[PDB]
Design a protein around this nucleic acid. Structure first.
Ligand SMILES: CN(CC[C@H](N)CC(=O)N[C@H]1C=C[C@H](n2ccc(N)nc2=O)O[C@@H]1C(=O)O)C(=N)N
Ligand SMILES: [Mg+2]
Ligand SMILES: [Mg+2]
Ligand SMILES: [Mg+2]
Ligand SMILES: [Mg+2]
Ligand SMILES: [Mg+2]
Ligand SMILES: [Mg+2]
Ligand SMILES: [Mg+2]
Ligand SMILES: [Mg+2]
Ligand SMILES: [Mg+2]
Ligand SMILES: [Mg+2]
Ligand SMILES: [Mg+2]
Ligand SMILES: [Mg+2]
Ligand SMILES: [Mg+2]
Ligand SMILES: [Mg+2]
Ligand SMILES: [Mg+2]
Ligand SMILES: [Mg+2]
Ligand SMILES: [Mg+2]
Ligand SMILES: [Mg+2]
Ligand SMILES: [Mg+2]
Ligand SMILES: [Mg+2]
Ligand SMILES: [Mg+2]
Ligand SMILES: [Mg+2]
Ligand SMILES: [Mg+2]
Ligand SMILES: [Mg+2]
Ligand SMILES: [Mg+2]
Ligand SMILES: [Mg+2]
Ligand SMILES: [Mg+2]
Ligand SMILES: [Mg+2]
Ligand SMILES: [Mg+2]
Ligand SMILES: [Mg+2]
Ligand SMILES: [Mg+2]
Ligand SMILES: [Mg+2]
Ligand SMILES: [Mg+2]
Ligand SMILES: [Mg+2]
Ligand SMILES: [Mg+2]
Ligand SMILES: [Mg+2]
Ligand SMILES: [Mg+2]
Ligand SMILES: [Mg+2]
Ligand SMILES: [Mg+2]
Ligand SMILES: [Mg+2]
Ligand SMILES: [Mg+2]
Ligand SMILES: [Mg+2]
Ligand SMILES: [Mg+2]
Ligand SMILES: [Mg+2]
Ligand SMILES: [Mg+2]
Ligand SMILES: [Mg+2]
Ligand SMILES: [Mg+2]
Ligand SMILES: [Mg+2]
Ligand SMILES: [Mg+2]
Ligand SMILES: [Zn+2]
Lengths: 85, 104, 159
RNA sequence: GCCCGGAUAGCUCAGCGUGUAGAGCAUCAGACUUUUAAUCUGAGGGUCCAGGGUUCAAGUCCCUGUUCGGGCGCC
RNA sequence: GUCUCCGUAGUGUAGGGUAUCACGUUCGCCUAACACGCGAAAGGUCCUCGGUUCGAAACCGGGCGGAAACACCA
RNA sequence: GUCUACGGCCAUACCACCCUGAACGCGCCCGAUCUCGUCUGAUCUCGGAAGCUAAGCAGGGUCGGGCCUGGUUAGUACUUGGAUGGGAGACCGCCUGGGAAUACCGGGUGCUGUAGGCUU
RNA sequence: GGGCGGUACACCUGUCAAACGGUAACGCAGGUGUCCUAAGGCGAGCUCAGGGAGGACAGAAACCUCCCGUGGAGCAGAAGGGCAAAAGCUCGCUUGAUCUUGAUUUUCAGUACGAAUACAGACCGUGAAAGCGGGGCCUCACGAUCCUUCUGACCUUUUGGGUUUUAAGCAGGAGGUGUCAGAAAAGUUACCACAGGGAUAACUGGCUUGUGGCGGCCAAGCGUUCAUAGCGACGUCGCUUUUUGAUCCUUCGAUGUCGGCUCUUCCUAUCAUUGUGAAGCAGAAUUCACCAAGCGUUGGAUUGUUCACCCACUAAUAGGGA
RNA sequence: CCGCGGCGGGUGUUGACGCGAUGUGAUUUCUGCCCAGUGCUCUGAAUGUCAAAGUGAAGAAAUUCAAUGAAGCGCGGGUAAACGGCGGGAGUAACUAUGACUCUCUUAAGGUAGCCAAAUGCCUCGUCAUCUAAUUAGUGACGCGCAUGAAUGGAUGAACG
RNA sequence: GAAAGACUAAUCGAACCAUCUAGUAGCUGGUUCCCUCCAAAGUUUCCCUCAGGAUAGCUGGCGCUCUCCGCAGUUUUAUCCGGUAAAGCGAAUGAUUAGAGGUCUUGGGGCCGAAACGAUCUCAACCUAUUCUCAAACUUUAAAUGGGUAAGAAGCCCGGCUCGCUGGUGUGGAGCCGGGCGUGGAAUGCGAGUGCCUAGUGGGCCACUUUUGGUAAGCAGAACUGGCGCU
RNA sequence: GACCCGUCUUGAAACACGGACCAAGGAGUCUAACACGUGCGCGAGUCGGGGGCUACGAAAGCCGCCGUGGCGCAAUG
């Protein structure tokens, strides 16, 4: 009264009837598993960005005119050729 | 193994490290009014006999060891437990070995 | 029924190469590792702290974390049919750069150099890599003499 | 796990908090005209292990190393 | 059916730095000679080869010999 | 060409025997009051400067070992795929494509990416 | 096959593993259920085994001294890996073997316990210092609910309100389940009964031929002399299924199971008879081989006997299958 | 001894030459040694362990802790026609030499009287003599008995089957 | 019951008749009309589990968001990884044969010797150069097949802002508001993406090579692909 | 050309089992609960199932100061 024990006979195909999925890749990957000292300082810098908008606003509202003044300162044979005309 | 009687370590209530007093731990007596005893006797009595199981196949021959760390500064007087790995032979605070003597 | 230990079957793998034992040289450490770089993994038997499990020795991934003495890393693995995306924390000794991306970062620049130039020239310069074509017809000059006649050797028992 | 008693010279083994007894083996002698049996000295003692307190410990208490009684049992 | 001991003067036989008893047997001691009793002989490949060893027969196997063992349940 | 701190796998940089070493330098060397240590002022620590080329030093040398690279060994050994191809079987040939390693015979013996003082 | 015998029933180390990883058998060679206040954590300082040359008693081997000395030593245990101004050896100072949220790896269902790696917030140890350290240099040394016991906070509940005892509460360790993801458990039936199985034994038959039986080649010697008339050592190639083993394919909703009596047939590897060769064959006797299975191959004592053993006769008292 | 039960019932209309419970198996003849074990019984404050109740103290009380503590097991005597058991250390002379007498003693004593290859003895078809032309069986003997034996009965012997 | 587990209405190692009752079964057998479409597994972990169930796997059904950028059991070009077949002892770790030169490095005996490494025949070990064969749990070297990554807009390149972490120096990074750049940056082929409920199965077999035990087997046990089972 | 059908089985014409022959009868049903798909009405609300009022009919129709109540709109310790 014995019995077979272990085998791997049909599993290199029994896997390929529905494909081998590359892992679903995607942008904006998560932030779970980072050290809290780095993530704290990034959180306070994500919390006090609305303190310095005006110098950022006028310094982006100057290159729109320097570009609009810079772009303003910048601005086979013969029988066959006839028959294809 | 062999442990010394006084270890200096953390204390929860005081905040700092403070010296302690080390002794080991023994169990308390089973009280009779506790809920699993007022249930076990109330269920045991009458006919029917034995209900809950009885352990018989004891295998291993050793206990884990638990220390009982008591504070020393007479205003705190707090205690907490502690756990050490398994051992058979055991003592506290006596006759620490040395280096290089005559072994018979 | 083999065992399931941490370091099964790594006699030759964590071993040091021949005549390269001894002290870890000091230009392994002071190289810089940003986030996003591509990294291959090679084990080492000297510094036992922070080894990878034996099934990563050769794989290659990218970084998501930097620590005080370690970087986190995202790799890929194949378990019974599917593919898992798993992340570890590896000390610096067991880690190198990969130079696979570099001939691409040398060909992005070479192409944009070959594009900024000669576009204003109205020239059409070839950009795609094209495989090795079949070779051209060419002459062979035998000035004077004739080809050397070969002869298959007659057998004799060498031994 | 509770309580309880037990370990001494090479075998059995005494010890009365103020000291290591004994009987039988092994030697050397004495007694008998000579062998037997009995007579006597001598050699061997770490009082099962560490501490205690006492002037003084083998001895009371303490635990650990060794054998055993008994009643008990919810992971 | 094969595993467990052990092989040693002529007999049988005690046991990491020599080969030992008891008897077998030659010569010598007390005596009145006699018996008992006593002291010195011969006797050794400590089974046949290779290694551990400064030195192995007593440690290690491989091996040949003998004896004492075992095979159960249609 | 030298001193200080280094880099790379750390040998083309090692080991053994020889030899010449200008000037600045490094060192053996002179010593023991100064809380530096030893059984011992040798080693370690300090205060020094009469006197001189052995020194892991520096450079060259050996029909040198060693190492580093190249040919031979060799399209050999081995090998992914295939055949109603042999052979009693062991194993060997073919098509298709990949393809090693010693012995043996040759050449080399520190570049210094390096910053500061210096053959200047 | 069961049984007796074992643990491959939880773990780790080399090998089988076919050059990532994974991978089996009652496959091999081996080990564990612990040990340590230092054998843990820092720092200074040293360098080992063996070998040479010497030196009073000193010898194979005590201690001292000089030189060579890439690990040939050691690191508590099994074995690999790892280590030279150390992870070793010798001294110094101590208790990071402590307290607390998570994240990840390991086998893996990508669940747990176990073990481990990187971080972060506290208090300390250290070294002038940079930093190293939250347990043994790495790879093994261990454990669920339920219940119990202990500690923790000026904690909440103890039921019509209020106070004090008790109990119940939440958090963390411990009390163990080795059949190791965890029941509380000794035997026999020849007086025996039911549900099933050819997944699993006892007969035959099948494939195999080690053991048993039979036959070859080679040629050192025996043979008064002379290798091969007859024989054959150490060696080597085969067949046979009348012995026993090995295996488990078919039948367990049944193929009637040892011997003998009786009764036909068959094979040849021939005991005798027919015809013929060689002898160490003079005759008589006897041994050896070829074509050859038509014809024969017996009577009795003891044992359940197949087997054996012994008394007579004879031409001969050959061996077997279905 | 019966029985669910009571002043219940049988043995019992009975009384130790009697009821009841056991092992052996006629007569003749003998019945061995061992009380450590498992049983059985007797002396038990000669005492180590031993419930409920009734008692003392501390507490507001529920409670908690102490003294004392019946039988029986433990300790101590009796008992084998009660179950059951009966091995070992190698030679001691004065020729073979089995072996005198012992050697020798460890865990309660250590197979006596007597019988045998039996219906009990693996080696086994044991060896010797006889019975047969020839006997693995029978009868007589030897004992070292894998594993004979004394009321778990041993040896006996006319009649009977 | 003068005992054999005998007999007790043809029934006895616990009678017969009715009720709870249609008692339980991981165990044997059977399971009722046609066509059309799709189509498998005998493996994984845990179980007083090995004739069995849970779990993941394979399968079918109903739909959905887009297309009417994306993926692939494959190859090329760059790149790292590995210790197998071969080979090698004149290289370490282990096993092993025969001679050659030396001084004795030491002995057991010849040997002349009141002694010797004086001299010794030496057998012998000792040192140096050489030689014959080997290796799953030995290795300097080291192939074939084979295993991951990368092959542009999820990229490059210019301004600028915030930061309580890091800091000699706006240093060092990270995160943010903005702008600019398309010859689509190897070859070949193809429409893709996710989300539910769920049946059956977990007794497996043969060959080519590769391979362990065994004398060998139409025997037992594993790896790669392919088939019968389902034809 | 062509072995006899059902059945367990890795493997049936089997020396595996049940089956002499014809007619009728014969085996996934019934409640409660939950989960998901699908069809219908009303919609931040929905539902009268229990109760009442006025031959087929033991049906149908109504009641909102009979909407109490159920699930839902708000979780956590
Ligand atoms: C147990 N017995 C045997 C009688 C049994 N009831 C039936 C029977 O024949 N049993 C026997 C039959 C087969 C069994 N047996 C024997 C040999 C073997 N290799 N395998 C077996 O299974 O051994 C059994 C044995 O006697 O004990 C007795 N009480 N006598
Ligand atoms: Mg199976
Ligand atoms: Mg009661
Ligand atoms: Mg005298
Ligand atoms: Mg220079
Ligand atoms: Mg000048
Ligand atoms: Mg050279
Ligand atoms: Mg592979
Ligand atoms: Mg250690
Ligand atoms: Mg150090
Ligand atoms: Mg910290
Ligand atoms: Mg019977
Ligand atoms: Mg019978
Ligand atoms: Mg069968
Ligand atoms: Mg047969
Ligand atoms: Mg044979
Ligand atoms: Mg002759
Ligand atoms: Mg049948
Ligand atoms: Mg029949
Ligand atoms: Mg013939
Ligand atoms: Mg009687
Ligand atoms: Mg008795
Ligand atoms: Mg007798
Ligand atoms: Mg008779
Ligand atoms: Mg008897
Ligand atoms: Mg009697
Ligand atoms: Mg009668
Ligand atoms: Mg009977
Ligand atoms: Mg019954
Ligand atoms: Mg039914
Ligand atoms: Mg029924
Ligand atoms: Mg479909
Ligand atoms: Mg279980
Ligand atoms: Mg089953
Ligand atoms: Mg099932
Ligand atoms: Mg090999
Ligand atoms: Mg099979
Ligand atoms: Mg097979
Ligand atoms: Mg087919
Ligand atoms: Mg198919
Ligand atoms: Mg036809
Ligand atoms: Mg069937
Ligand atoms: Mg079945
Ligand atoms: Mg079958
Ligand atoms: Mg099937
Ligand atoms: Mg069929
Ligand atoms: Mg059937
Ligand atoms: Mg039928
Ligand atoms: Mg019908
Ligand atoms: Mg719905
Ligand atoms: Zn404290």
């Amino acid at each position: 009264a014995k019995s077979k024990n272990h085998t791997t006979h049909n599993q290199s195909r029994k896997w390929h009837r529905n494909g081998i999925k590359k892992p679903r890749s995607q942008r904006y990957e998560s932030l779970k598993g980072v050290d809290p000292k780095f993530l704290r300082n990034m959180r306070f810098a994500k919390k006090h960005n609305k303190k310095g908008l005006k110098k950022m606003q006028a310094n982006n509202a100057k290159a729109m005119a320097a570009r609009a003044e810079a772009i303003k300162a910048l601005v086979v044979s013969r029988k066959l050729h006839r028959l294809a005309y | 193994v062999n442990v010394p009687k006084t270890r200096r370590t953390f204390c929860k209530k005081c905040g700092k490290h403070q010296p302690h007093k080390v002794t080991q731990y023994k169990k308390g007596k089973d009280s009779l009014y506790a809920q699993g005893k007022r249930r076990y006797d109330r269920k045991q009595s009458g006919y029917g006999g034995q209900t809950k199981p009885i352990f018989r196949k004891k295998a291993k021959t050793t206990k884990k060891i638990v220390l009982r760390l008591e504070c020393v500064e007479p205003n705190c007087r707090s205690k907490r437990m502690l756990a050490i790995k398994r051992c058979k032979h055991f003592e506290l605070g006596g006759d620490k070995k040395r280096k290089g003597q005559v072994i018979q | 029924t083999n065992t399931k230990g941490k370091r099964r079957g790594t006699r030759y793998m964590f071993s040091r190469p021949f005549r390269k034992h001894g002290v870890v040289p000091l230009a392994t450490y002071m190289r810089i590792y940003k986030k996003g770089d591509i990294v291959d993994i090679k084990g080492m038997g000297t510094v036992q702290k922070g080894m990878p499990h034996k099934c990563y020795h050769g794989k290659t991934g990218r970084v998501y974390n930097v620590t005080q003495h370690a970087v986190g890393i995202v790799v890929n693995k194949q378990v019974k049919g599917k593919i898992l995306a798993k992340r570890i924390n590896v000390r610096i000794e067991h880690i190198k750069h990969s130079k696979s991306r570099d001939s691409f970062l040398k060909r992005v620049k070479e192409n944009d150099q070959k594009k900024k130039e000669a576009k204003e020239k109205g020239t059409w310069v070839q950009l795609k890599r094209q495989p090795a074509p079949p070779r051209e017809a060419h002459f062979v000059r035998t000035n004077g003499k004739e080809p050397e006649l070969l002869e298959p050797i007659p057998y004799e028992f060498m031994a």
